[PDB]
Amino acid sequence: CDVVIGIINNTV
Amino acid sequence: WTFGAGAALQIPFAMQMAYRFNGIGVTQNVLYENQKQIANQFNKAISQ
Secondary structure (H helix, E strand, O other): OOOOOOOOOOOO | OOOOOOOOOOOHHHHHHHHHHOOOOOOOOOOOOOHHHHHHOOOOOOOO
């Protein structure tokens, strides 16, 4: 995760 | 992206290229892996 601007965690 | 049939819908134009990677059929890891380089190629291209 390096250029990810908007970040959404906990993708299941 | 949608324009013409429509008005506009607030897309921030790297997201335009991110969708337009389909009109060639490629990933969005073209741009965002190569952000400033692709930007500068666009800039150098216009300057030339």
